[PDB]
Design a protein that fits this description.
Three copies of one chain form a homotrimer. Chain A has three helices and two strands, in the order ααββα. Chain A is mostly helical and 118 residues long. Chain A has one domain (1-118): Phospholipase A2 domain (Phospholipase A2, Up-down Bundle). A two-stranded antiparallel sheet of chain A has the order 1-2. At the A-C interface, α2 of A face loops of C.
Chain lengths: 118, 118, 118
Protein backbone atom coordinates (compact mmCIF):
# COMPACT_ATOMS: atom_id res chain seq x y z
CA UNK A 1 0.00 0.00 0.00
CA UNK A 2 1.36 3.38 -1.12
CA UNK A 3 0.19 5.11 2.09
CA UNK A 4 2.24 2.55 4.05
CA UNK A 5 5.24 3.15 1.81
CA UNK A 6 4.97 6.89 2.42
CA UNK A 7 5.05 6.38 6.20
CA UNK A 8 7.91 3.89 5.96
CA UNK A 9 9.95 6.61 4.22
CA UNK A 10 9.76 9.02 7.14
CA UNK A 11 10.10 6.13 9.57
CA UNK A 12 13.49 5.13 8.22
CA UNK A 13 14.57 8.53 6.96
CA UNK A 14 14.66 12.20 7.86
CA UNK A 15 13.31 13.18 4.42
CA UNK A 16 9.64 12.53 3.55
CA UNK A 17 8.12 10.94 0.44
CA UNK A 18 7.54 14.31 -1.22
CA UNK A 19 11.31 14.76 -1.39
CA UNK A 20 11.42 11.86 -3.84
CA UNK A 21 8.46 12.86 -6.03
CA UNK A 22 10.70 14.48 -8.67
CA UNK A 23 14.14 12.99 -8.23
CA UNK A 24 16.49 11.64 -10.89
CA UNK A 25 15.38 9.40 -13.74
CA UNK A 26 13.39 6.85 -11.73
CA UNK A 27 11.83 8.38 -8.59
CA UNK A 28 8.21 9.10 -9.47
CA UNK A 29 5.86 7.53 -12.05
CA UNK A 30 8.12 6.04 -14.71
CA UNK A 31 11.78 5.75 -15.58
CA UNK A 32 14.12 6.03 -18.54
CA UNK A 33 17.87 5.90 -19.04
CA UNK A 34 20.27 4.79 -16.36
CA UNK A 35 19.89 5.72 -12.68
CA UNK A 36 22.09 8.79 -12.09
CA UNK A 37 23.00 7.94 -8.50
CA UNK A 38 22.48 5.59 -5.55
CA UNK A 39 19.15 7.16 -4.58
CA UNK A 40 17.81 7.01 -8.16
CA UNK A 41 19.09 3.43 -8.15
CA UNK A 42 16.90 2.80 -5.08
CA UNK A 43 13.82 4.08 -6.91
CA UNK A 44 14.86 1.97 -9.90
CA UNK A 45 14.79 -1.19 -7.79
CA UNK A 46 11.58 -0.39 -5.94
CA UNK A 47 10.04 0.39 -9.32
CA UNK A 48 10.89 -3.09 -10.65
CA UNK A 49 9.74 -4.62 -7.38
CA UNK A 50 6.25 -3.20 -7.81
CA UNK A 51 6.26 -4.30 -11.43
CA UNK A 52 7.06 -7.84 -10.23
CA UNK A 53 4.36 -7.63 -7.55
CA UNK A 54 1.71 -7.97 -10.29
CA UNK A 55 3.07 -11.45 -10.99
CA UNK A 56 1.61 -12.49 -7.64
CA UNK A 57 -2.03 -13.68 -7.45
CA UNK A 58 -4.38 -10.97 -6.17
CA UNK A 59 -1.47 -8.57 -5.73
CA UNK A 60 -1.63 -4.85 -6.55
CA UNK A 61 1.33 -2.76 -5.26
CA UNK A 62 -0.88 0.27 -4.70
CA UNK A 63 -3.97 -1.41 -3.25
CA UNK A 64 -2.48 -4.12 -1.02
CA UNK A 65 -2.58 -3.40 2.70
CA UNK A 66 0.06 -5.36 4.61
CA UNK A 67 1.27 -5.57 8.20
CA UNK A 68 4.28 -3.67 9.47
CA UNK A 69 5.46 -1.73 12.50
CA UNK A 70 7.67 1.32 12.79
CA UNK A 71 10.00 1.77 15.77
CA UNK A 72 11.54 5.02 14.56
CA UNK A 73 13.80 4.42 12.65
CA UNK A 74 13.17 0.67 12.38
CA UNK A 75 10.72 -1.00 9.99
CA UNK A 76 9.50 -4.56 10.47
CA UNK A 77 7.50 -6.49 7.90
CA UNK A 78 5.51 -8.89 10.04
CA UNK A 79 3.67 -10.80 7.27
CA UNK A 80 4.71 -14.43 6.73
CA UNK A 81 1.68 -16.36 5.43
CA UNK A 82 0.42 -13.72 2.97
CA UNK A 83 3.09 -13.91 0.22
CA UNK A 84 1.79 -10.82 -1.60
CA UNK A 85 1.73 -8.80 1.60
CA UNK A 86 5.19 -10.12 2.51
CA UNK A 87 6.61 -9.33 -0.95
CA UNK A 88 5.15 -5.85 -1.10
CA UNK A 89 6.18 -4.83 2.41
CA UNK A 90 9.71 -5.94 1.58
CA UNK A 91 9.82 -3.84 -1.59
CA UNK A 92 8.80 -0.75 0.39
CA UNK A 93 10.98 -1.42 3.43
CA UNK A 94 13.89 -1.89 1.04
CA UNK A 95 13.22 1.42 -0.69
CA UNK A 96 12.62 3.38 2.53
CA UNK A 97 15.89 2.10 4.04
CA UNK A 98 17.76 2.55 0.73
CA UNK A 99 16.39 6.10 0.51
CA UNK A 100 17.70 6.94 3.97
CA UNK A 101 21.24 5.60 3.60
CA UNK A 102 21.64 7.14 0.16
CA UNK A 103 22.84 10.74 -0.32
CA UNK A 104 20.42 13.33 -1.69
CA UNK A 105 21.94 15.19 -4.65
CA UNK A 106 19.74 18.26 -5.19
CA UNK A 107 21.83 18.63 -8.30
CA UNK A 108 19.78 15.66 -9.55
CA UNK A 109 16.30 17.02 -8.87
CA UNK A 110 14.53 17.88 -12.14
CA UNK A 111 16.88 16.29 -14.69
CA UNK A 112 14.14 14.11 -16.17
CA UNK A 113 13.99 15.89 -19.54
CA UNK A 114 17.76 16.45 -19.70
CA UNK A 115 20.27 14.33 -21.62
CA UNK A 116 20.84 12.61 -18.27
CA UNK A 117 17.85 10.30 -18.63
CA UNK A 118 18.26 9.38 -22.30
CA UNK B 1 18.32 -24.02 17.13
CA UNK B 2 19.75 -21.73 19.82
CA UNK B 3 22.98 -23.74 20.31
CA UNK B 4 23.50 -23.24 16.56
CA UNK B 5 22.89 -19.50 16.75
CA UNK B 6 25.47 -19.32 19.52
CA UNK B 7 28.16 -21.02 17.43
CA UNK B 8 27.26 -18.88 14.43
CA UNK B 9 27.99 -15.81 16.57
CA UNK B 10 31.58 -16.78 17.29
CA UNK B 11 31.93 -18.15 13.77
CA UNK B 12 31.22 -14.79 12.16
CA UNK B 13 32.35 -12.55 15.00
CA UNK B 14 35.10 -12.03 17.56
CA UNK B 15 32.77 -11.61 20.53
CA UNK B 16 30.89 -14.67 21.81
CA UNK B 17 27.18 -14.96 22.55
CA UNK B 18 27.67 -14.13 26.22
CA UNK B 19 28.75 -10.67 25.10
CA UNK B 20 25.22 -9.91 23.93
CA UNK B 21 23.12 -11.39 26.75
CA UNK B 22 23.11 -7.93 28.42
CA UNK B 23 23.19 -5.42 25.58
CA UNK B 24 20.99 -2.40 24.99
CA UNK B 25 17.20 -2.56 24.82
CA UNK B 26 16.74 -5.66 22.65
CA UNK B 27 19.70 -8.03 23.01
CA UNK B 28 18.65 -10.86 25.30
CA UNK B 29 15.07 -11.64 26.34
CA UNK B 30 12.34 -9.15 25.53
CA UNK B 31 12.87 -5.63 24.29
CA UNK B 32 11.35 -2.19 24.76
CA UNK B 33 11.73 1.31 23.37
CA UNK B 34 14.01 2.28 20.52
CA UNK B 35 17.09 0.20 19.80
CA UNK B 36 20.01 2.38 20.96
CA UNK B 37 22.53 1.47 18.28
CA UNK B 38 23.26 -0.66 15.22
CA UNK B 39 23.99 -3.72 17.34
CA UNK B 40 20.76 -3.32 19.33
CA UNK B 41 19.02 -3.00 15.95
CA UNK B 42 20.60 -6.30 14.94
CA UNK B 43 19.06 -7.89 18.04
CA UNK B 44 15.75 -6.13 17.36
CA UNK B 45 15.58 -7.62 13.84
CA UNK B 46 16.62 -11.08 14.97
CA UNK B 47 14.07 -10.86 17.76
CA UNK B 48 11.24 -10.18 15.25
CA UNK B 49 12.60 -12.92 13.00
CA UNK B 50 12.10 -15.56 15.70
CA UNK B 51 8.63 -14.23 16.42
CA UNK B 52 7.85 -14.56 12.69
CA UNK B 53 9.19 -18.12 12.67
CA UNK B 54 6.29 -19.27 14.88
CA UNK B 55 4.06 -18.48 11.90
CA UNK B 56 5.69 -21.41 10.10
CA UNK B 57 4.17 -24.92 10.50
CA UNK B 58 6.20 -27.05 12.91
CA UNK B 59 8.63 -24.22 13.53
CA UNK B 60 10.11 -23.36 16.95
CA UNK B 61 13.09 -20.92 16.91
CA UNK B 62 14.74 -22.47 19.96
CA UNK B 63 14.51 -26.21 19.33
CA UNK B 64 14.46 -26.32 15.51
CA UNK B 65 17.69 -27.80 14.17
CA UNK B 66 18.80 -26.72 10.71
CA UNK B 67 21.80 -27.35 8.49
CA UNK B 68 24.62 -24.87 8.25
CA UNK B 69 28.39 -24.91 7.96
CA UNK B 70 31.04 -22.59 9.34
CA UNK B 71 34.20 -21.88 7.36
CA UNK B 72 35.27 -19.24 9.86
CA UNK B 73 34.48 -16.48 9.45
CA UNK B 74 31.88 -17.71 6.92
CA UNK B 75 28.42 -19.17 7.63
CA UNK B 76 26.39 -21.06 5.04
CA UNK B 77 22.77 -22.11 5.40
CA UNK B 78 22.34 -25.35 3.44
CA UNK B 79 18.57 -25.86 3.82
CA UNK B 80 16.38 -25.33 0.77
CA UNK B 81 13.51 -27.84 1.02
CA UNK B 82 12.88 -27.35 4.75
CA UNK B 83 11.26 -23.88 4.77
CA UNK B 84 11.39 -23.62 8.57
CA UNK B 85 15.01 -24.77 8.83
CA UNK B 86 15.87 -22.33 6.03
CA UNK B 87 14.02 -19.39 7.57
CA UNK B 88 15.56 -19.93 10.99
CA UNK B 89 19.12 -20.52 9.84
CA UNK B 90 18.78 -17.25 7.93
CA UNK B 91 17.52 -15.30 10.93
CA UNK B 92 20.56 -16.44 12.90
CA UNK B 93 23.08 -15.94 10.10
CA UNK B 94 21.71 -12.44 9.59
CA UNK B 95 22.13 -11.70 13.29
CA UNK B 96 25.57 -13.35 13.67
CA UNK B 97 26.92 -11.36 10.71
CA UNK B 98 25.17 -8.14 11.81
CA UNK B 99 26.70 -8.55 15.28
CA UNK B 100 30.14 -8.95 13.73
CA UNK B 101 29.99 -5.80 11.59
CA UNK B 102 28.33 -3.78 14.35
CA UNK B 103 30.44 -1.78 16.81
CA UNK B 104 30.25 -2.69 20.49
CA UNK B 105 29.42 0.35 22.63
CA UNK B 106 30.29 -0.83 26.15
CA UNK B 107 28.45 2.32 27.17
CA UNK B 108 25.26 0.53 26.07
CA UNK B 109 25.58 -2.55 28.26
CA UNK B 110 23.03 -2.59 31.11
CA UNK B 111 20.71 0.28 30.10
CA UNK B 112 17.51 -1.79 29.93
CA UNK B 113 16.10 -0.18 33.07
CA UNK B 114 17.33 3.30 32.11
CA UNK B 115 15.32 6.06 30.40
CA UNK B 116 16.86 4.95 27.10
CA UNK B 117 14.65 1.88 26.64
CA UNK B 118 11.60 3.89 27.66
CA UNK C 1 22.86 -19.84 -16.90
CA UNK C 2 26.64 -19.35 -16.99
CA UNK C 3 26.56 -17.07 -20.08
CA UNK C 4 24.08 -14.85 -18.21
CA UNK C 5 26.25 -14.79 -15.09
CA UNK C 6 29.26 -13.87 -17.21
CA UNK C 7 27.39 -10.93 -18.75
CA UNK C 8 25.99 -9.88 -15.37
CA UNK C 9 29.60 -9.47 -14.21
CA UNK C 10 30.45 -6.99 -16.98
CA UNK C 11 27.14 -5.26 -16.23
CA UNK C 12 27.66 -4.70 -12.52
CA UNK C 13 31.41 -4.33 -12.54
CA UNK C 14 34.48 -2.98 -14.29
CA UNK C 15 36.32 -6.31 -14.36
CA UNK C 16 34.95 -9.12 -16.57
CA UNK C 17 34.41 -12.82 -15.79
CA UNK C 18 37.91 -13.83 -16.89
CA UNK C 19 39.34 -11.73 -14.05
CA UNK C 20 37.93 -14.09 -11.44
CA UNK C 21 38.65 -17.34 -13.31
CA UNK C 22 41.86 -17.72 -11.25
CA UNK C 23 41.26 -15.86 -7.99
CA UNK C 24 41.84 -16.96 -4.42
CA UNK C 25 40.72 -20.30 -3.02
CA UNK C 26 37.16 -20.37 -4.39
CA UNK C 27 36.78 -18.32 -7.58
CA UNK C 28 36.71 -20.70 -10.52
CA UNK C 29 35.83 -24.39 -10.27
CA UNK C 30 36.32 -26.09 -6.92
CA UNK C 31 37.32 -24.46 -3.68
CA UNK C 32 38.84 -25.47 -0.36
CA UNK C 33 40.10 -23.71 2.75
CA UNK C 34 39.22 -20.25 4.04
CA UNK C 35 38.26 -17.54 1.56
CA UNK C 36 41.31 -15.25 1.61
CA UNK C 37 39.42 -11.99 1.17
CA UNK C 38 36.16 -10.17 0.45
CA UNK C 39 36.09 -11.10 -3.23
CA UNK C 40 36.97 -14.73 -2.42
CA UNK C 41 34.09 -14.80 0.05
CA UNK C 42 31.89 -13.65 -2.84
CA UNK C 43 32.87 -16.70 -4.87
CA UNK C 44 32.53 -18.91 -1.79
CA UNK C 45 28.92 -17.77 -1.36
CA UNK C 46 28.06 -17.93 -5.03
CA UNK C 47 29.56 -21.40 -5.17
CA UNK C 48 27.32 -22.61 -2.32
CA UNK C 49 24.39 -20.95 -4.05
CA UNK C 50 24.86 -23.02 -7.20
CA UNK C 51 25.18 -26.12 -5.08
CA UNK C 52 21.89 -25.28 -3.33
CA UNK C 53 20.23 -24.61 -6.67
CA UNK C 54 20.36 -28.34 -7.48
CA UNK C 55 17.94 -29.01 -4.61
CA UNK C 56 15.29 -27.29 -6.71
CA UNK C 57 13.29 -29.48 -9.13
CA UNK C 58 14.53 -29.25 -12.72
CA UNK C 59 17.24 -26.83 -11.65
CA UNK C 60 20.75 -26.87 -13.12
CA UNK C 61 22.87 -23.77 -12.31
CA UNK C 62 24.81 -23.95 -15.58
CA UNK C 63 21.94 -24.84 -17.89
CA UNK C 64 19.03 -22.81 -16.50
CA UNK C 65 18.13 -19.76 -18.58
CA UNK C 66 16.43 -17.04 -16.57
CA UNK C 67 15.04 -13.60 -17.25
CA UNK C 68 16.99 -10.52 -16.31
CA UNK C 69 17.80 -7.09 -17.70
CA UNK C 70 20.93 -4.97 -17.46
CA UNK C 71 20.92 -1.17 -17.25
CA UNK C 72 24.63 -0.76 -16.55
CA UNK C 73 25.51 -0.86 -13.81
CA UNK C 74 22.13 -2.28 -12.69
CA UNK C 75 20.85 -5.84 -12.79
CA UNK C 76 17.23 -6.87 -12.37
CA UNK C 77 15.94 -10.42 -11.95
CA UNK C 78 12.45 -10.42 -13.43
CA UNK C 79 11.42 -14.01 -12.56
CA UNK C 80 8.77 -14.58 -9.88
CA UNK C 81 6.77 -17.71 -10.82
CA UNK C 82 9.76 -19.82 -11.87
CA UNK C 83 11.39 -20.53 -8.48
CA UNK C 84 14.52 -22.12 -10.00
CA UNK C 85 15.04 -19.27 -12.48
CA UNK C 86 14.44 -16.77 -9.67
CA UNK C 87 16.84 -18.48 -7.26
CA UNK C 88 19.62 -18.82 -9.82
CA UNK C 89 19.33 -15.28 -11.14
CA UNK C 90 19.70 -14.14 -7.53
CA UNK C 91 22.82 -16.20 -6.96
CA UNK C 92 24.41 -14.61 -10.03
CA UNK C 93 23.18 -11.06 -9.48
CA UNK C 94 24.46 -11.32 -5.92
CA UNK C 95 27.85 -12.53 -7.07
CA UNK C 96 28.11 -9.97 -9.89
CA UNK C 97 27.40 -7.15 -7.41
CA UNK C 98 29.59 -8.58 -4.59
CA UNK C 99 32.34 -8.85 -7.21
CA UNK C 100 31.94 -5.21 -8.21
CA UNK C 101 32.03 -3.75 -4.68
CA UNK C 102 34.81 -6.04 -3.48
CA UNK C 103 38.47 -5.00 -3.86
CA UNK C 104 40.72 -6.97 -6.21
CA UNK C 105 43.96 -8.05 -4.51
CA UNK C 106 46.22 -9.14 -7.37
CA UNK C 107 48.30 -10.62 -4.59
CA UNK C 108 45.59 -13.28 -4.29
CA UNK C 109 45.65 -14.44 -7.91
CA UNK C 110 47.21 -17.90 -8.14
CA UNK C 111 47.44 -18.95 -4.48
CA UNK C 112 45.23 -22.05 -4.78
CA UNK C 113 48.17 -24.42 -4.31
CA UNK C 114 49.84 -22.35 -1.58
CA UNK C 115 49.59 -22.68 2.20
CA UNK C 116 46.73 -20.17 2.11
CA UNK C 117 44.05 -22.52 0.75
CA UNK C 118 44.66 -25.30 3.26
Amino acid sequence: NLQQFKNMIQCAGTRTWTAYINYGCYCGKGGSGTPVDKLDRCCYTHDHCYNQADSIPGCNPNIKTYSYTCTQPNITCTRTADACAKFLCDCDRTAAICFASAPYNINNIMISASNSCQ
